[PDB]
């Protein structure tokens, strides 16, 4: 990890594309191993956000496994996004109530 992070400087975060909001700061504690959309729907339903997707899911699922305890939803989504790095993407438009899940496009 060190040698990757020094051969490549990280330029940006993902909090600018996932900022927080009141009712996004509820907390949750999760274990998971399944696919992604079931999980994100459960999040958006507890977060009272409409959940939508963009693009088409590939045949091989992107499967993640998140395991954390007493932690808020915004960076729940941040590390989900990280765990599905470069196969999936999360954006939230909390001026609306929308969690959108973009797929990869191949």
């Amino acid at each position: 990890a060190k040698v990757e992070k020094v051969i490549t400087p990280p330029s940006k975060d993902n909090t600018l594309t996932i900022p927080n909001a009141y009712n996004l700061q509820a907390r949750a504690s999760v274990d998971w191993s399944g696919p992604i959309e079931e999980l994100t729907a459960r999040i958006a339903k507890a977060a009272h956000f409409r959940f939508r997707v963009l693009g088409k899911s590939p045949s091989v699922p992107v499967l993640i496994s998140i395991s954390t305890k007493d932690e808020s939803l915004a960076e729940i989504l941040r590390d989900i996004d990280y765990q599905a790095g470069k196969k999936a993407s999360i954006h939230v438009y909390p001026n609306s109530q929308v969690v959108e899940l973009r797929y990869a496009k191949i």
Binding site: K2, V3, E4, V6, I7, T8, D31, S33, V60, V62, L63, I64, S65, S67, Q83, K86, K87, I106
Partner: protein, 200 residues
């Protein structure tokens, strides 16, 4: 004789007894197991399972009394990158098989415990080997991502060629992507183009 069968009565007994044991502790730390061995973190863009690369230092084979041959350092690409469907687990590698046999004088009792111990620890060694196998895998694909980060190996260079609606009046397929992996990962040899990271 009676001897050896009292031993061998023990042998499979302790062996399978041990196998059942190791199987439950596998199960209770199953979370911990993949919690270590998150393979998908290591898999690639087109779920290409990356190849396992092998380290080498001071590979000195003496050929003989007259000539020796050493590398300082050595890499072995094994099990070249490939399309995977479902990413690996550990239970593929560590779930020890368990079967139960109970199928059949003081030598009987003591050599049965002899073999009881014996099957136990040969299973332990078996287990050990299973662990080592999953090591060398995991470390191998780590090292792939390493030398890929080091410019010391190449990517899987692919071509996805796509097809539109394909098929006849009885069968169609509305979109057929086919993906070939054109150029496999491989160790580059012009080391001038490498990537040597200092750290702080």
């Amino acid at each position: 004789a009676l001897k050896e069968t009292a031993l061998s009565v023990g042998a499979q007994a302790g062996l399978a007894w041990r196998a059942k044991i190791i199987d439950e502790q596998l199960n209770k730390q199953a979370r911990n197991l993949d919690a270590i061995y998150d393979f998908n973190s290591l898999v690639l863009e087109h779920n290409i399972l990356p190849p396992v690369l092998l380290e080498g230092r001071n590979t000195l084979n003496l050929a003989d009394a007259q000539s020796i041959r050493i590398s300082d350092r050595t890499y072995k690409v094994a099990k070249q990158a490939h399309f995977i469907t479902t990413p690996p687990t550990w239970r593929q590698y560590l779930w020890m098989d368990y079967v139960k046999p109970e199928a059949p004088k003081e030598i009987w009792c003591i050599y049965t415990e002899r073999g009881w111990k014996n099957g136990i620890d040969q299973a332990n060694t078996i287990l050990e080997e299973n662990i080592a196998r999953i090591k060398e895998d995991f470390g191998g694909m780590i090292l792939y991502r390493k030398l890929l980060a080091m410019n010391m190996v190449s990517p899987p260079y692919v071509s996805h060629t796509d097809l539109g609606v394909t098929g006849d009046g009885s069968e169609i397929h509305i979109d057929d992507r086919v993906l070939r992996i054109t150029a496999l990962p491989e160790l580059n040899v012009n080391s001038a183009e490498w990537r040597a990271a200092v750290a702080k």
